Design a protein around this ligand. Structure first.
Ligand SMILES: CC[C@](C)(O)c1cc(=O)c2c(C)cc3c(c2o1)C(=O)c1c(O)cccc1C3=O
Length: 154
């Protein structure tokens, strides 16, 4: 959980379908952020999700109004898609991010309810200045990595 976010690439297979992987993201990504063992500093309130290229996802915080914490780049019909993240230093959305980075993500459907996902983020440090702090509100726990909470619920 370093304050700086250098380029890192990790991937794992979870029991889920690529369409399902995104159904959860566009269905209720905040509802599972907080499982129980780990608590979130801010309570998620609502979430807006629409499909498209250069897309955007919005999260509602009881203390934070509606804002965009991520972005998209393009969707590949099969099961592959690249996405960009749109966020500001104070969790605010802006017409364009000078410190924006590109992320490459690919999904592969595996029968028996299994999906392989490869998510890699590079040049993220472009935001620096407490960059992880921004992610910290989004919850960046180490003991309960993202694969632990979101994969188990899926
Ligand atoms: C501490 C948060 C974590 C898990 O290290 C993290 C941080 C990550 O940077 C991260 C990266 C690099 C890749 C994945 C994932 C990544 O998530 C990831 O969570 C993931 C997943 O939950 C299910 C399928 C695939 C993935 C990933 O490919």
């Amino acid at each position: 959980m370093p304050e700086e976010i250098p380029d890192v690439r990790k991937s794992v297979v979870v029991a889920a379908s690529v369409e399902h992987c995104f159904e959860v993201f566009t269905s209720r990504p905040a509802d599972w952020w907080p499982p129980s063992h780990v608590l979130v500093k801010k309570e998620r309130a609502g979430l807006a999700f629409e499909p498209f290229v250069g897309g955007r996802y919005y999260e509602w915080d009881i203390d934070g109004t509606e804002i965009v914490w991520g972005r998209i780049l393009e969707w590949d019909p099969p099961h592959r898609l690249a996405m960009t993240w749109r966020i500001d230093g104070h969790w605010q959305s802006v017409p364009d991010d000078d410190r924006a980075s590109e992320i490459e993500v690919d999904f592969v459907p595996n029968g028996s309810g299994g999906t392989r996902v490869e998510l890699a983020h590079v040049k993220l440090h472009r935001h620096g200045d407490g960059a992880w702090n921004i992610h910290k509100a989004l919850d960046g726990p180490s003991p309960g990595e993202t694969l632990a909470r979101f994969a188990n619920v899926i």
